[PDB]
Amino acid sequence: KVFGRCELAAAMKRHGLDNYRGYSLGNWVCAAKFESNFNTQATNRNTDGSTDYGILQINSRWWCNDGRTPGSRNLCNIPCSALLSSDITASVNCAKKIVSDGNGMNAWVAWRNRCKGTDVQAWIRGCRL
Ligand SMILES: [Cl-]
Ligand SMILES: [Cl-]
Ligand code: NA
């Protein structure tokens, strides 16, 4: 599913991401914009053989099992394919564990390079929340 900006902001808010670990909603929307263009079906293979999945491009290296990432972990206890669902629950629930992992949203390299330190509130401006 490809979400509209405000539609995903509302879904993210409902699932508890607004100010989760201190990150206002626009940070979550901005990260999703640049990680997947708001497409729950996005996937992207990494050079080490791991794959990123979903609206927040969660990596199989640590967080989910895809049966093809040698030596990886499944810290979120879920098959990576669950992160591609039109239902964002798993992506949100696993992103909550990642952002609680000590590095905050720096875990998402696109957030660090394209959202951090910017006016992220613009990503939810105008949305009914
Ligand atoms: Cl594996
Ligand atoms: Cl933090
Ligand atoms: Na894995």
Q: What is the maximum alpha-carbon separation in the chain?
A: 44
The edge-to-edge listing of strands for the beta sheet with 51-53 is 43-45, 51-53, 58-59
By what technique were these coordinates determined? X-ray
Q: Are 36 and 56 in contact (CB under 8 A)?
A: yes
Nearest 10 degrees: Cα torsion 81, 86, 91, 92 = -160
CA distance 118 to 3: 22
Ligand number, closest to the Cα atom of 62: 3
Residues 6+ away with beta carbon under 8 Å from 26: 9, 120, 121, 122, 123, 124
Range of the domain at 126: 1-129
SS (H, E, C) the chain: CECCHHHHHHHHHHCCCCCECCECHHHHHHHHHHHHCCECCCEEECCCCCEEECCCCEECCCCCECCCCCCCCCCCCCEHHHHHCCCCHHHHHHHHHHHCCCCHHHHCHHHHHHCCCCCHHHHCCCCCC
Q: Can you give the CATH number for the domain in which 30 is found? A: 1.10.530.10
Q: How many domains does the chain have?
A: 1
Residue 99 CA, ligand 2 centroid: distance in Å: 8
Phi, psi dihedral angles at 48 (to 5 degrees): -85, 5
Q: Are 122 and 83 in contact (CB under 8 A)?
A: no
Q: Is 101 within any annotated ligand binding site?
A: yes
Residue 58 CA, ligand 3 centroid: distance in Å: 10
Sort 108 into a burial class: Cβ within 10 Å, 0-12 / 13-18 / 19+. Answer: buried
Active site residues: 35, 52
Amino acid at position 30, single letter = C
